[PDB]
């Protein structure tokens, strides 16, 4: 009962290549607040800022 | 067989670390953006000084 033919040999499966996706988002920029005038002249307000 | 499944667990862990280093906040694209913006501001400020 030993077969004369030799058995066929299986081919192993292909492994999966794990891949990541890196995307970026776009947040909208902020606008300016309102111009509020003050009492001070230029150099004092400049140094303060 | 247990050695093989241990190695596949190691591979999945390496994939997890790589996805972490891509998807964390301070990644390489952040520093590229910072170096570009800071370089432009730095050059213009150099000219004024």
């Amino acid at each position: 009962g030993q077969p004369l033919h030799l058995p066929i040999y299986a081919t192993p499966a292909d492994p999966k290549a794990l891949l990541s996706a890196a995307v970026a988002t776009s947040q909208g920029g902020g606008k300016l607040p309102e111009s509020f005038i003050s009492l001070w002249r230029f150099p004092h307000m400049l140094e303060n800022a | 067989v247990l050695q093989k499944t241990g190695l596949k667990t190691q591979q999945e862990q390496t994939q997890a670390q790589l996805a972490f280093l891509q998807r964390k906040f301070s990644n390489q694209a952040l520093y590229n953006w910072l170096r570009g913006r800071l370089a432009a501001i730095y050059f213009q400020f150099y000219d004024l000084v």
Side-chain angles (χ1 to χ4, degrees), chain A residues 16 18-22, chain B residues 11-12 15 19 22-23:
Chain A
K16 62 183 181 180
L18 293 170
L19 179 57
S20 298
Chain B
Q11 186 188 10
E12 188 177 2
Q15 186 65 42
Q22 293 182 0
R23 287 191 179 95

Side-chain angles (χ1 to χ4, degrees), chain A:
Chain A
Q2 293 180 357
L4 294 177
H5 67 90
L6 296 178
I8 200 63
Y9 294 99
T11 298
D14 295 337
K16 62 183 181 180
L18 293 170
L19 179 57
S20 298
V23 304
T25 62
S26 176
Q27 297 297 106
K31 61 179 72 175
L32 296 177
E34 187 175 0
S35 297
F36 176 70
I37 196 166
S38 68
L39 276 71
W40 293 99
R41 286 174 182 175
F42 186 75
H44 296 276
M45 196 67 207
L46 179 62
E47 186 270 333
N48 195 2

Side-chain angles (χ1 to χ4, degrees), chain B residues 25-47:
Chain B
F25 181 75
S26 67
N27 55 1
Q28 187 175 2
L30 179 62
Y31 295 107
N32 291 120
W33 181 65
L34 291 181
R35 187 179 65 83
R37 184 176 177 87
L38 185 60
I41 296 171
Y42 182 73
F43 182 74
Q44 298 179 358
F45 189 76
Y46 170 73
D47 292 331

